[PDB]
Paper text:
Whereas the fungal enzyme belongs to family [name], the two bacterial enzymes do not lie in the current GH families but instead define a new family, [name]. The TIM-barrel core structure with fully conserved active-site residues and a negatively charged substrate crevice is conserved among all the families. The putative active-site residues (Asp156/Glu225 for TmGH191, Asp323/Glu391 for Env-[name] and Asp157/Glu225 for FsGH114) overlap well with the experimentally verified nucleophile and general acid/base Asp189/Glu247 in Ega3, Asp196/Glu222 in Sph3 and Asp160/Glu223 in PelAH.
For FsGH114 no activity was seen using the isolated Pel substrate and further studies are necessary to establish the exact substrate specificity of FsGH114. Similarly, within the [name] family, F. solani [name] overlaps with Ega3 (AfGH114) with an r.m.s.d. of 1.49 Å over 218 residues, with a sequence identity of 35%. FsGH114 also lacks the first and sixth α-helices but has a C-terminal extension folding into two strands forming a short antiparallel β-sheet. One of these tyrosines or both could play the same role as the tryptophans in the other three enzymes (Tyr121 is poorly defined in the present structure). The acceptor side of the substrate crevice in FsGH114 is flanked by two elongated loops comprising residues 164–168 between β4 and α4 and C-terminal to β6 residues 231–239. Thus, overall the crevice of FsGH114 is deeper and more pronounced compared with the bacterial [name] enzymes, but also with Ega3. To gain better insight into the substrate interactions, we docked the substrate into Env-[name] and FsGH114. In both cases up to seven subsites could be identified. Whereas the Env-[name] binding crevice seem to better fit the galactosamine oligomer, the FsGH114 crevice can accommodate either an acetylated or a non-acetylated GAG oligomer equally well.
Numbering used by the authors: 31 to 317
The structure:
Amino acid sequence: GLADFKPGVQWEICIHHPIKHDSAADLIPTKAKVWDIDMGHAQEFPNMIPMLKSAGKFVICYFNAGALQDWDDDKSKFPKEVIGHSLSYPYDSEEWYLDIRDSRVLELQTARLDIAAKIGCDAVDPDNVDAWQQDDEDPTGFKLKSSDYTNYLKNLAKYAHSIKTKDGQPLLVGQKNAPEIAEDLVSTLDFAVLESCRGNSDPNEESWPFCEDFQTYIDAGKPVLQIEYPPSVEKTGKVSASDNKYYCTAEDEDKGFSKIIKWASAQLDGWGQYCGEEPFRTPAAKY
């Protein structure tokens, strides 16, 4: 339902493992109408998106727009010159920021958009578009400006908005975080996916709240898909009473967002919780 794809829509995100999809009954939680899944997992399990579509779901395909990963099928096509610092620089890792000004990166990323369109995705959720140099600290090594990310996302959107999905409509493109450029992108992009817009319940964490910067998407009739990671979950397996107050108590700044509680940014698995409800778990497919 593209009709359903509007502010307030219920959703689930599960990118750490493939979702189970033998039947519609596997698609826990059943009230989620929007499903954000890893584009690779959808290719590895070819009946996944068909199953989602048969159950009436709108499908968002996650991919990594701003960083290259050691396991990417297309990794060998990226020149060394566009590969920057490890996401744990100075330590080597399996993930490295890309020079998203570069035409070669754009070409490779648009080929991924072609795949998203071919396999049945209604939309894409492009990651890591927030790594410009800030306060004399440079995440990528390329000394990127916030406007470089605005331009890149506009280029991704221009491409996606020129190709059709399997349901016969333009491919949609989300904004992932990057609150500073929401006002510059809201006309172009189709929705937002946020992590920790409410900040952090540990006030000593550097985590300035930014939910208010995405009200402009709600104003445009575009959903804001809001992920919160209460610290207590990763530590204890449960949302503490104090974390429930911090993340779930009604506030103007995230009014109208589609809020979900998840385990950790590095563990966006099937576990989840809606405010005012017990947790659920989307089951995993087996390799």
